[PDB]
Structures are given as C-alpha cells and as structure tokens.
C-alpha cells in the first residue's frame, strides 16, 4: 500500500561539489516515485546578476548487494539471525557526513551503503575517466571539504578544461630491422595501436569496451549505481536596487529559482538506497584565457590554414597552460587535438573585469596539475558572494515521495493479537 515518505529538505553547499540532498531506503519489490519541488538560491552576490548558474539533480539506485557483496547475500539467506551489517566510521563534526545528507549517528558512524553508495556514484559518473577511483574506506578518510560539502565535480567542457587523456600517446614505435621493415608487421602495428587508442579516448570503462562490441552490460555486471532520473536547469533571479544616499546606483543580484524533478515510478528489484544529489556549477569563464592562435607567437601553415589533410592525420598536440593563459608557466602541459582551436572559441572577459568581485568568473590562474585544473576550483567563487553562513547556495524543497509496498499496517504490528 502507498507509503507516504514525503519530507522537507533544507539544503546548502559549495559550487562544484557533489552533495547528497535526500536518500530513501527501499525494499525488494516496492515501487518508488518522487516529486521534488523547491527553489534554489545562491548566497547574496556583491553586484547585479551577470551569469546564470546551471543546476543538476540526480537520482540513482544502488542495491545493497552492490555494497556488501557476498556479505549481504548471506545476510538475506541467514535471515533473522544473520550477523548485523557493520556501519562505517566518521569524523568528529556534526557536519561530518554532510556529503551523505545525514547527521552522523551519536557514535559518529553511518551506513556503509551511504558511504560506498556515494563513492560508487562518483567514481562511475563524475570523476574524470582517466582519473583514479575514490577508494576511501570511511568518511573519516576523505578530505574535510570533500565530506563537508562533497567531492569536486568536473568543470563544463572547454578547450583547456577537457584535455585529451594525459596518458595519450603522441608516438608509437615499431621495432624494425636495421635495413628492412616488415611491410606486414607494420600493418599489424597499426591494428594494435588502434585498439589501444580507442581504450584511451573512449573505452576506459569495461561496460564501454563492451558496448563497442555491439553488446550490453547490466549495471549488475560492473556494479554501477543505476541512474534513474536526471534534471538540469539554469538558476536565475532579479537585482535589488539600493536606494540610500551612498548605495543609490548599486545593485545586488537575487537568485531565486523554482525547480522540479520527477523520478518516474520505479520498480526496486532488490533492497537498497535511492540517492538524490545536487551539483551547482558556473561555466568555466576565466578572466585571463587567450585564443590559442593569439597566445602562441609564430603561426605556421599547420596552425593557421586548417588544411584537412594535416589536421586529419597527425598526433595529438602537447600544449601548455601558457598558450592559453596570459602568465601561465610554459611547463604545465596537456594534449589537445590538432585544429581544436578551430572547432571552438573561449569566452572573453575585458581586463576591466579581472579587478572586480561580484562576477561568477575564474579570476585566478589554472592549476598547473591536470586533474585539479579540470575538476572545478570552487574556492575561486568565494569572492562573488557578500556574507555567507549558508555556503554558496541554499535550497528549500519538499520531497513528495510515494512508495507502494505490501506492508503490515500500523495497528497490526502493535497488535500482538
């Protein structure tokens, strides 16, 4: 029978960090549907609105088996006298499970499926794909801010914000004879590099190298949380006009955004949790990014002509944060696709701006390091807001859930009978 598991949510977090806003434990065989409707607000910013932030709300299903593996299987089999499922440990702070959208129990411990569940959802859909998994054991092992506000999500695809995989080959040797090459061996050489290149660029995931075989893999083959629903939108608001002697001609942008998310009814195969997370981000607009062709001094035929034959046939080009940013070290490199500068265009911000707080732009220079300079650098948004004890953004939503089960009943459980 319909079980109304509705509840209110009073949220808040940083800019480019994934954070759990709601979770509902589900049992095997029940149908789950939710209607999440609220408003998203940003902290008051220092001037008028200039650029809308984009918001992504995700609802996933992670069965317990996925989390406890064989331990869970045995638990279900063993039944009533199964050994209790050991929760996970947390860090000394009421805001020490935040990322799990839950208050750490009185003993500072929490469900592993809440932890691993979360871990599994990031390492499978947010973490850059050449990147290493968050193999955190317990929330007491994750960085303070990773578990306060959540781990950093990736910046919105730019030219410099989506470099080619760093382990990307720029050459490939075939050991040849001293005065002869094997015309047939060469052929083969190319076949192998192909298979390698594909794995590097597109199939870094099993489920991915499979799909290109024309097959399919159940979220049960690779233990990946199942993405049930996804909502995306741009949050906006209005400016407030100051009207006293001193702040007459001054404004403060107020971002109030009504949003809604609908998770269509869903059949829960096994017992598990449904995680609903939010992520607020701004387009990667840096105040000092230059057009590659304008930042790289001598222009050769290969750079300026856009000869099809050329672009379509040479290795990825290794560039530095220096051919894209005005002061940046010659030393911080990344691999780009030849002619990439012709498939795109950076946003452009006049110098008059780079000295102004209140603009949701990237002031600072990138981060020499690949990873870090891709997964967004949240902190470079601290200067955009006024005062804030409600982080960068806060949310007030009413999670209207409806679960259809085969439950006892309230009176038949308390009725020894």
């Amino acid at each position: 029978v319909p079980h109304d598991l509705s509840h209110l949510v009073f949220e808040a977090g940083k800019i480019g960090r994934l954070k759990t806003i709601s979770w509902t434990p589900v049992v095997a065989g029940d149908s789950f549907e939710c209607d999440m409707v609220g408003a998203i607000r940003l902290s008051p910013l220092r001037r008028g609105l200039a650029v809308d932030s984009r918001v992504d709300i995700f609802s996933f299903y992670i069965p317990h088996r996925h989390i406890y593996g064989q331990q869970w299987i045995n638990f279900m089999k063993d039944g009533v006298n199964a050994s209790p499922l050991p929760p996970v440990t947390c860090s000394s702070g009421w805001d020490s499970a935040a990322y799990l959208g839950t208050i750490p129990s009185s003993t500072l411990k929490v469900p592993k499926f809440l932890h691993q569940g979360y871990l599994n959802i990031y390492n499978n859909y947010f973490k850059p794909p050449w990147s290493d998994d968050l193999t955190y054991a317990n929330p007491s092992n994750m960085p303070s801010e990773d578990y306060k506000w959540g781990v950093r999500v990736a910046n919105l695809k730019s030219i410099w914000t989506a470099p080619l995989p760093p382990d990307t080959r720029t050459s490939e040797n075939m050991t040849t004879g001293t005065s002869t090459i094997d015309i047939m061996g060469l052929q083969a050489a190319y076949a192998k590099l192909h298979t390698e290149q594909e794995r590097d660029y597109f199939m870094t995931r099993y489920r991915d190298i499979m799909k290109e075989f024309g097959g399919h893999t159940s979220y049960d083959g690779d233990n990946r949380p199942l993405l049930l629903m996804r909502s995306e939108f741009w949050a906006s608001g209005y400016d407030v006009d100051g009207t006293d002697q001193s702040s007459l001609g001054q404004f403060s942008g107020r971002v109030q955004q009504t949003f809604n998310h609908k998770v269509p009814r869903f059949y829960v195969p096994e017992h598990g949790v449904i995680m609903t997370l939010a992520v607020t981000r701004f387009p990667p607009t840096h105040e000092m990014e230059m057009h590659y062709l304008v930042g790289k001094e001598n222009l050769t035929y290969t750079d300026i002509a856009c000869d099809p034959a050329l672009m379509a046939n040479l290795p990825p080009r290794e560039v530095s944060l220096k051919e894209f940013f005005h002061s940046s070290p010659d030393s911080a490199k990344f691999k780009i696709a030849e002619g990439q500068w012709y498939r795109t265009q950076p946003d452009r911000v006049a110098f008059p701006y780079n000295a102004l707080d209140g603009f949701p732009f990237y002031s600072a220079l990138p981060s020499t390091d690949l990873k870090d300079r891709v997964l967004v650098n949240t902190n470079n948004y601290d200067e955009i807001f006024q005062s804030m004890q409600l982080a960068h953004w806060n949310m007030q939503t009413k999670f209207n859930i409806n679960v259809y089960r085969h439950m006892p009943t309230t009176r038949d459980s308390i009725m020894t009978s």
Partner: protein, 177 residues
C-alpha cells in the same frame, strides 16, 4: 566591513602651503589670500601673543551664483602649539562687492560646531549651513574658520586648515558599482 563613503569635509584635491606671520586681533586678520570655493592651508602660522580675546582667520570666498540661497560650508583643521583655549567657530560676512578682505569686519555671523582641543593641538570636522546670496545688493559674501582664545602667545602654530563650499559633490570610485 563595508566602507563608509560619506564624509563631513571633502577638501579640494590640492593644498597651498602657507608661511606667514600674523597679528590675531578681534578684527581678526586673514591668514591666506582668499581663494574661491575651497582651499586647504598649512601655514605654520606665526602668532604674536595677544591677551584680549580677538583672533585670526582663514575663510574662502563663496560663489554667489545659484538659485539656491542656502549652501553647506564644511571646514576642518588640526593645529599645534595652539593655546589650549582654541575654539573654532565658523563665520560669514559680506564685504562690498568685488572687494578683497584682509580681515573680518565688525559684522559677521557665527555658527558653532564640534571643535576639540587637548593641549597644544586642535581639530575639527563639521558642517554649517549658511545663506549663499549677498545679504545686500552691492557686496559679496565670504566664510571660513576662525581661531579664537584668550591668550595668544609668541609661538608658531603649525597645522592645517581646509574650508569648502558644497557647490558640487566629488564622487569617487565605489568598488561594488
């Protein structure tokens, strides 16, 4: 904290160095030749000792052309070796028109402010709203700061003095605008 962007005295951007003795009697002389709407002098003032409750001035010459009769006159000083009796009230007077004062006539108006004096130094920063048109046809109107005390001894009192006539505002850069 936010920055206060309102002040009682917005001195001209420039200061004219003074250096010139004076004899501060009742018929209070004039420190520096009167400018037009604002000045700021730092005249190591030299002051012949005078025990008779008279004094020496520093005012500007108000601009007599605006359909608004009442204007705001803001002053501001900081002086040393100032007899610890220093009161800086403000003033206004109308001399004949086109004439340049060398001291205030017997006929002038006063407007108190908030002057604080310790021992040997005094400062102030206040605003007084005076009437801008010549009270009489053929004359002009002047206004400024006046140092008044009992005993004016043999001493050079250095410090500075500024007087402005809010004719116009001087609006600076506000970082959140």
């Amino acid at each position: 904290m936010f920055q206060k962007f309102i002040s009682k005295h917005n001195a001209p951007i420039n200061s004219t160095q003074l250096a010139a003795t004076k004899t501060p009697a009742v018929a209070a002389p004039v420190l520096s030749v009167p400018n037009l709407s604002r000045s700021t002098i730092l005249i190591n003032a030299t002051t012949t000792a005078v025990t008779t409750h008279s004094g020496l001035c520093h005012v500007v010459r108000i601009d007599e052309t605006n359909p608004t009769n009442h204007h705001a006159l803001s002053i501001a000083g900081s002086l040393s070796n100032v007899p610890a009796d220093m009161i800086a009230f403000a003033i206004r007077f109308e001399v004949a028109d086109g004439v340049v004062p060398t001291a205030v006539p017997a006929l002038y108006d006063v407007y108190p402010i908030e002057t604080f004096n310790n021992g040997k130094a005094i400062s102030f920063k206040d605003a007084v709203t005076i009437d801008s048109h010549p009270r009489t046809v053929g004359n002009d109107v002047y206004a400024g700061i006046m140092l008044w005390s009992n005993a004016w001894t043999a001493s050079t009192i250095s410090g500075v003095l500024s007087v402005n006539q809010v004719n116009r505002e001087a609006t600076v850069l506000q970082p959140l605008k």
